[PDB]
Structure formats: C-alpha cells, structure tokens
Symmetry: D2
Subunit: 348 residues, 4 copies
C-alpha cells in the first residue's frame, strides 16, 4: 500500500493469548489465590475490612529464580501477618521509561536487546502462575494495551502509572479489568487526574481492543468500581497527613470514598530507596493514630538492597534490582512488621 | 472476563484499505505534504506549516465544503504557507466522535464510522488538500494514517510510553503538546523517545497482534498550547527555544492559537495571530507552524445548524481568510 | 515444515466483500435465480435449468462479451429455460495443470491469488449486476467465502463427489448444488453425496474473517445429480430410467441434470450437439425428470494450448456461439413440446 | 449465510503446539522413522514398514497400553521390521455413527473439537516420546496442522485419493504418504495422486496461527500405493505383479503397501491372518516390491457398539473389528521371519 510502513522496520509473529493460557493454565490453587485476594481487596475498598493492602516487591522482575526466592520469603510473612495485612507481591514485567531503556522481562527477557517477546510472555506467565500457585497473590502495572490478555487472570491488583493516568485507553482498559486498579496521581503531584481516572474507569465503555485470539475487536466493558488513588509524590512528597487530608476532601467532593494507597517509593522517597523506611514511619504513625483512609501501601523491595547496571556488562548480582533501587530483605521484614503493628494499633 | 460485557466484530484495516484505496492524486497529496513539512522541520524551507480546520468533524458534507474553500487559499498562499486541513474526528473529554459514533445515538457503529472517516480523508486528499490527524489510540491509525500528512499526539498522552512508541513508527511528522502547566519537559522527553527505534506489540493491517520494530521518527516537534497562562509570546518562545537547544533538539515550535493560548475565547485566536505574525514578520525563524480551530460558521453548538462546530468554538470563514492572509504576509516579511 | 517453501499473505473474504459489495441488481439476480432453481427442483416449474458457458474463465473481457450475448438469450427463452452462465474460476486437474483464474490469474505460474480473487469477484459482480445468474464449481475449501453470495448454483466435481469436506461444504451453501457421478460412472457416490449434503454437519472451516473456526450447517435440500458419463455415455433414456429408479430407491426426487460434455461427449465438443438432440427428444417425448443440462460453450469453438487467441477455451474444448444459440433454441423447443 | 447455523471458536494450532510441544525424544522418534521409511521407499533398506494398531482410537489409556506392547516388539524385531503404530481418530463413513476422538472425544455427540484436539495431540506426543512412531490418516485440510509434526507416515482417505485438495495437502506434508487404490481395485487414480503429490503446488491453507494464507509446497516424493482390495482382494502375487507392471508403465517405483484389512480380508478381522500368510509367502519367496503392510490390531480382538449410559469393554474397538494382541504378536513374528527369509 502507498504511504505505508516507512518507519516500520520489521513485523514478527506474536503468540496469541490463548496459546499462553493453554500452555500455562491456572491451577485450582492459583485460581483460588487470585479469587480470594481480589475479594479481600474489594472488602477493604468497601470499608468492610480494617486490614492494609500491601503491594511489595521488586521494581522489576528480571530473574525468575530470585523472584521465586523472594516470593517464598514474602509468603511466610503474608501468612504470619494476615490478620493485619493483605500482602500481594509486586510482579512487574513492564516498565515505563522517562525516555528510553530496558522495558522489562516481557519486552526483552534476555536483557540483550534481542526482544524475544514470545519467550518473555512464556517466562512471565509461568512465573506468575508459580507465584499464585504457591499461595501468594500478585500485582502488576498495566502499561501495554496488548500484554494484559496474557496475564490479567493471574493478577489480583493492578496499577496504571503516573504517566498514563490521563490516558483514555488506559482508563478504558481499567473499566474492563477483573481486578481492582490503582491510579497514581500525576507526575507533578496533581490529584485531579487520578480522581477523573477513577470516575472514568467506573463507567462502561466501548472501544477497540485485542481479544484472547490475538484479533482486534470492538469491546464493551461494564465499568470497574474497585478503583482507588495511589499517592506517589509530586515535586515534593505527598504522603503526610496534610496531603492525605487534602486528598480525602477531594475524593469526597467528587463523590468518592476517602481512601488512599500510599506509594513509599518514587517521588515520595525522592527516589532514595532507604527513605521508604522514613515514609513507613510516618504512615505507621498515621495508621496507629487512627487514620482509616490509608487502605494500602506500595513498597519497592528485593532480596538485596540497592541496584546495579545492566549496561556495564558485568555479571549481575543475584537478587538485586537492575532498575530502581529497592530496600533489601531485612528492611522489608522490619517494614512489614511495622505496618502490621500499626494496623493492630489502629484497631485496638 | 467479569467486566467485559460484549465483543463485536471489527473490520480489519486491509478491508478499509481495499474498499477505499488511495487514488494516485490522494497518494501524491500525502507524499508531497509530508516531504514539504520535513523540509520545513529541517530548516530548508522558510514557509509556515498551517494546520487549520474544525475542532472535530461531525458532518462530512460541511467538512468537504470547508475543504474546498481551504484548498483555494492553500493554492493561493502556497509560496508562504503549507496549508493542511485539520481532520479530527473526536474531542477528548459526550459525543464520542465520528468514528466511535457516526450516527450520534450511542449506537457505537465503529465499522461504519471507520468507513465514513476513511472516505472523507480519501476525498479531501484526492482533491489535493492534505490532512492532519490526532492519534488518540493504537488501533485506529492503521485505518487512516496513510492519508495523513501530519499528526498530533493527544495532550493527555504526551507522557505515555505507548503513544511515544506509536509516534516512532508513524510515516508522517508528529507534534507533541507541552504540559498542562506550560512546561516542555514532557514534550522534550516525548520527542527524544519518538526519535529512537522501539520494539513493541501492535495490531497489523490484518487485524492481528504482532511484534513491530520501528525506526524512530525524526520529524517530531513541540506544540505550544499554553499552560495556566498563554505561552505564544516572544518571551515564552525564547524560553522554549533555549530549553530545546539545551536538550540538543532543533529550536523550532508550532503554536496552537486555540485552547489555553486563546484563553478559551475563539475570537482570541486572531489575537494570537497578530502577536505571532509580529514575531514572524520581525524575523522569528523558530516558529515553523501554527494550529487554528476554524469552521464555516463561527462559535459552537450543543447536540443542528450547518457548518458550525458541535464541540469547541472556532473562528468562522471570514476570519479564517483574514488569518491565513496575515500569516502569509508575515512569512513574506520574514523572508525579506 | 520441510516441504512448505513459502507462506504469503491472503486477503480475508471481508476485504473482497467490502471492496466489491453486491449491488441491488446483483443481489436480486442471485435471489431470483436461486428461487427459480428451487422451484424447478421442487417440481413446481416445468422450465429447464441450463448451466452453460466456458469450461473455465481466463479473460474477463471475453467473459463479459459472452455474458451480454447469453443474457439476451436468457431474456428471449425465459419461458422455457432458466439460463445460468458457467463462470468457473477453479479447475480440478487429472494430475497437474493450470488451476484457473483465481489460482493463477496471469497464467504464468506467478500465483497472484489476491489479484485472482479481486478479478474473479469483480467479474462475478458485473455479470450478476447485468442480470445474468452465475454458476461455478466449488472445489477449493477456502475460496467459496469470497464468491458464494454471487452464485446461484454450484457443482461438486466428479473427483470430489466422494469427498467428505465437499459434502460438508455443500450442506452449508446458500445455493442449489449438483453432484457429478463418479468418473467411472458410479451413480451411488452422487446419491450418497446428496443425502450427506442434505444433513446438518459440524466441521472445521474458515470464516469471512480468514480465521479457522468450528462451523455448524443446516443441511442443503436443493441438491441433485449431474450425469456426466463414465466409460460410456450415460445420457440415454435407458440410463436416465436407471438413475430415476436408483433415486427412488434412495428416497430422493427422481430428477437429473445431464452434462452434455466430458465423458458423455467422449471429450469431443461437437458431440455435445448430438447429446443435445438425444436429450431434447427425451424431453419432447415427455421426460419430466430431466430438470437441467450443462453445456461447455465459448465465443469461439474448440480449445488452445497455453499471446492467446480470442474467445477460445484454454482448458476443455467447447462449442462456439453459433452452435450455442442453436442448442438453446433446440432445448427451449423441446421444453415447449413436453409442456 | 442462510445454511450456516452457528460458528464457534477454534483453538489455533499454535495453542496446541505450545501446550504439547514435541519433547526431544518425541522429535527424534519422528525424525528417525521418517528417514527409515524414506530409505525403505528408495530401496536402500530391505526391511518391511508395518503400520499396525486400532481401527480408531477412542481411549487414550488402552492406546498407551497397546503402544507399550507394540514398542517391545518394535525393539525385538527392529532388524526386520520398521514398526509404526496406527494412531487413527475416526472411521470415515456415510452412515451415521461416532465421529471419532477429535470430533467427539466424549463419545456423546457434544462435538467438543477443542477437547478432542488436545486429547489427540497429547496421545501422539506420549506415544512418540516413548520411542514408538505414529501413523495417521489425513481426512481434512485443517486438523493436520495440529498433529502432523508427530506423524512419521500418513494415509490419504480412500474417498479422497482423486481430490485435488487432498493431493495438494500431500505435496506439502513432512512425512511419507500412502494413497489407496480405487474402490473397483484399479490403480489409475492412485498413480495420478502420486504424480500430483510429487509436484510443487500453490494453494490456500490455514497456517499454525489459524489464519488462511497462500502456501507453496515442494512436492512429496515419498508417496506410494496402498493395495486395499476392490471387488475382490488384491494382495495375491498375481495382483502384486499387475500393480508392479502398472507402476513401471507409469515411471513410478514398483513398490506397494498391502492393507490386510477391509476388502482384502473380506471384512472379517481374523482373515487378516490369512492375508498375512499369503504375503509372508511372497516375501519369503523373494518379493521385494512389498515395502509395507497395514494391519487393524487392538489389545482385545473383535469390536463393540457404543451405547449411551453404558460402559465399554476395555481395549476393544468401537468401530471396525481388529485382531487382538495374541494374533498381533504372531503376525508380527510371521512378517519378521518372512523378511529374514527373503534375504
Ligand atoms: O513501578 C512503578 O510503580 C513505577 C514505574 C517506574 O519504576 C518506572 O518504570 C521507572 O521509574 C522509570 O525509570 P527511568 O526514569 O530511568 O526511565 N512507578 O512509576
Ligand atoms: O468443468 C467441469 O464441469 C468439469 C471439470 C473439468 O473441466 C476438469 O477440470 C478438466 O477436464 C481437467 O482437465 P485435465 O484432464 O487436462 O486435467 N467437469 O469435469
Ligand atoms: O490388558 C487387556 C487385555 O489385553 C489382551 O490382549 C489380553 O488377552 C487380556 O488378557 C488382557 O486383559
Ligand atoms: O533514526 C532513524 C532515522 O531514519 C528513519 O527512517 C526516519 O525517516 C528518520 O526520521 C529517523 O531519524
């Protein structure tokens, strides 16, 4: 065709979602994990459970071995702390870049710009399956419009990133997802874009999308009422009581329940991974002092703290982020126990 | 699953491309206008790209009447201006636009809407008038982009990786709007992102998802659309030019006369025009394009009257003729 | 894998249907001719279905000339005959050979099938739009989605009458279907096919979207046998009596279509004129079981080997227009006598 | 679409290939048997291809027990026979009846074709992975894309030997292909089919993505005739000599596979043992043109009728009747001794 594909270099075959769903079906226990976690989060969001949703884990997954070791450790704490916390592992396979960079395990699993996306989808779904089958629910970021069909049935919660909260196609996607969805405030701190997103996601929509067969189609969604805001900072952090109070008022002014999830990382830690523990201290004091609106938190955590560079060509250290820096396991254990103690204090 | 109510059949792009293929004339219109804009962006033509037309298309009849009037000025002023008709089918916000609801009744006859939209784009290009589109999603461009000589990324998606990926593979030049607060950082990031090659998942002309690799698109530029205050003045242009230079990008801008630069007052577009013409006539080479919301009849309507916008308010045809002549005279002055 | 050398993109049927939609006239032509053949097959009409035209289409310009001439005779003889043009785009070869216009439109082994489908559907659309109904052989399992909405009647070839997938195909077609007897002359295989095609089936097929799917059909009751010879011709009234009796035993209407060409003519196109005389005398003598005939006819008689000569078949030899005009008049006269 | 009542979703072949990929053992089994059959067809091996197994598979459990028994004889008789298990899923018929494991795996008219494709591929995978190669029948154009990578040999349905579409299919199959003689016992149509299938073709087909496409094939030279009787059995030395003549006259290798069942056994399953005796006689005497045989065999001889609301006998055909394991063991040993005697 004339005037077509000047800037398209190559087009390669993509496994349809049904191929990944057939190769890696949910086990009974994996399906149980997803169903129970989605119901638990819904109950929190409706105000009928006083526990704290905790979405915690690596900035990005790049190594299934370390991810499964992390998952075993986190599952132990999920079981120990379950009367206070609903613990869901961050299993992020897609990373939004400020400009350019390794986009994650699905886009480039082999970490060498070979872009073996079919391998990436196989690795990602098998890992999500293993984690859910172990009994640990999983959270993801919905950035790509096409990858969710491959994974969403194994997601108990999802986030739409700050750079896409305003995006109509992402709001439409959320309106048809089967899990609860968090919408982050705008990268400059703006709350209104996330409030608008929650309202849009709760409405039914009609739009173009791709089916489990890998074919484009017209899709009609019902709307998703299980959406809430994620506070992730702006030019300055926005986790403190003053900010939470402003957001509660803004939600209620818009007719929405005053409830927030606080991201301890990103702009709320000023991109300094150990400051997540300082955010934790402040948020724990708010919770223990009686703040009911804090229904969830999000934490970037790995086996080993800090981060490392893929671009150097050095062999990668095990269990250590190749993207944002994370707190390590010992801080993670302490942080989770701090949150559990705060939730117990809030209740008693 | 739980929250998917219904899934309906969608014609693949190849069906629309086969039903409404580009005529030799339409193909030539697109090809020459893309090349003309590229030369402007490369600094090898001192003419001004002018993207002008309705806020959104709801009536193909009125749109083709508008196209005929505009083609006359495009040919008349061609030594100073590269005139491209704004052919936007939706207003991001209501009525979901011509593609999503051509019959205006919440029937969501998207297959009909795609047929109507492509036919209109084909007819306008066949007459010799190039068209400019807005790229709001990842699926509709496959049906229409071969008939687009320029496109804008929605302001709500400048920051979105998936829309920067899309731009990196588009065959036409692309404008990225500045941030809602008037800052340009996100737009600079978007131009840098869109300039690089990407690998991502997309839907082919066959209606199947696939892995696509793009080359990167060097024909991307900023659109100034205002922040809390208008940012069309010579002071703001100087600020934007320095920030572009600091980022290693060509110090060039397109200025949107409408929206926050017109302070939400359609007639104020003529005021931005007078100010921008002064800058150009005074020698400002960095202003390479403008965007104007214009229809047959000025104002707007609410879902009736013919040739009058049913979304945002536009200047009517007499102001449009005057505006285009003012810009052409300014370009003449700048040339010397 | 090892014996697949190339896989190339194929336009889906929706693309052809959108580019070349049925005009109002084309749709009316198809609906009327389908209704007319159904009326003839139900015995509620005494006219003769005449499926006549080139062995194969290889030149749309000559086909449109042929169509204009045949349309005039269709209008002239409309009281005795329901005239339907052979528009055959698919050719079953005894071994290897040019498979028709769709498979290789440029007859040079370039296999531009997307071009072939556009050419074929445009031609079929133009012919129906003029008012002339069309007939084809349904050989390919995937091409019928591109063309069947413009077909008023179809044939299953002698070499595929036994084929389960072709019986399934026929069970879901919107047009009447004829089944040729076996190449040895066996009648049973065509009777089995008619019974199978009349029943609902569930099988794998390709949709108008170009995707494979599970398809359920209703069954096609407008099917009938086509007598086309075997070792010896089987058009004589003795053979016709044998077939009507075999049809009765199987509980099927005792009606036949007779193919004047192929083994009935001993592969000699002029002998089609001799078969015509014999069949006309059966009809004029009172034979109501002969509900239709099939004739291989072109602008110029004979055939040629594969520039080409105008109006001559590049596959089986056919009779020319003069013989064609006279044959149709003989048949209409025979119908008028029978009535 | 007046006579199309319903259209239902179908898993594309890639979904089955991803769920049930060929193991290394399975892929090796397929490769080695395809090569061994090629050598036999080209005269570089004096061993006998034996395709043997149930008329149709209705029970994967009995099928795998049969495979385990057959594999043991495959190993024991490997110096004389290339033993390939018949893994057929359907009995083609014009009368009504069970539509086979792929169309109706649950044996109840639910037409759960997606289930049936999963069951059929999983069974083929398991049999190949154990080391036993598998032979299939090609009845349509769409199912082979789900299964053919696990077949070492295939037969085109007797009712489609003359069909251009099935000859096109054969011309692009990765395995050797057998074509059956005509219902009246003549070989003309099968000679035409062998010629047509050995030529390159270009035709429309469904890819592993479940999409129709234009496909070009190389031609299949590993095609041969299957003698299956006509009006009378055609396994006798007089008939083999007559077919050898016709194959030479056509410029094709004078080699044949003899089907011991159906018309050659007068539709009486025990008569397969009489055909075996005669064919062993020809082979032991020095007949080199007999390159393979086809035998309908199961754990338990005879057959049974499928009945709603009722259990079935284990290991016994619900389609045509088969010889049972005792006769199968004796038959395989007879053929092996005849091959030893020929050399
Ligand atoms: O995971 C999250 O919750 C995220 C995504 C976030 O991790 C992003 O992908 C990188 O911070 C970009 O890194 P860069 O700025 O180097 O492109 N929040 O935004
Ligand atoms: O059109 C028909 O009605 C037919 C089909 C017929 O035309 C066939 O395609 C050629 O006779 C094969 O020619 P060859 O024998 O040269 O391959 N009747 O059989
Ligand atoms: O294993 C199932 C059956 O197989 C047959 O070959 C044997 O004769 C039976 O004794 C056995 O029970
Ligand atoms: O970087 C790759 C370059 O070539 C691409 O094909 C584009 O035409 C150009 O804009 C880009 O800068």
């Amino acid at each position: 065709y004339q005037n077509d594909d000047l800037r398209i270099k190559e087009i390669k075959e993509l496994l349809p979602p049904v191929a990944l769903l057939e190769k890696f079906p949910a086990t009974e226990n994996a399906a149980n994990t997803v169903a129970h976690a989605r119901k638990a989060i819904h109950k929190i969001l409706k105000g009928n459970d006083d526990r704290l949703l905790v979405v915690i884990g690596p900035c990005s997954i790049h190594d299934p071995v370390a991810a499964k070791e992390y998952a075993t450790r986190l599952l132990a704490l999920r079981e120990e702390l379950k009367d206070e916390l609903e613990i869901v592992m961050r299993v992020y396979f897609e990373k939004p870049r400020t400009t350019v960079g390794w986009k994650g395990l699905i886009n480039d699993p082999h970490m060498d710009n070979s872009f073996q996306i079919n391998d990436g989808l196989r690795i990602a779904r098998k890992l999500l399956l293993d984690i859910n089958d172990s009994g640990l629910p999983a959270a993801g970021e919905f950035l790509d419009m096409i990858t969710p069909q491959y994974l969403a049935d194994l997601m108990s919660w999802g986030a739409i990133g700050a750079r896409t909260t305003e995006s109509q196609v992402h709001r439409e996607l959320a309106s048809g997802l089967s899990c609860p969805v968090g919408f982050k405030n705008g990268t400059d701190g703006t709350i209104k874009v996330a409030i608008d997103a929650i309202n849009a996601a709760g409405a039914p929509h009609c739009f173009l999308s791709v089916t489990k067969w890998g074919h484009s189609a017209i899709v009609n969604t019902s709307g998703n009422g299980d959406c809430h805001i994620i506070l992730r900072g702006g030019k300055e952090p926005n986790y403190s009581a003053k900010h939470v109070a402003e957001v509660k008022e803004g939600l209620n002014k818009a007719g929405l329940p005053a409830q927030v999830m606080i991201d301890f990382s990103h702009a709320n830690s000023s991109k300094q991974f150990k400051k997540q523990m300082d955010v934790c201290a402040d948020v724990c004091q708010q919770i223990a002092g009686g703040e009911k609106a804090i229904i969830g938190v999000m934490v970037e955590s790995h086996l080993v703290e800090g981060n490392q560079s893929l671009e150097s060509g050095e062999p990668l250290a095990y269990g250590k982020s190749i993207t944002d820096a994370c707190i390590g396991w010992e801080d993670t254990d302490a942080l989770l126990r701090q949150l559990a103690n705060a939730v117990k204090a809030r209740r008693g």
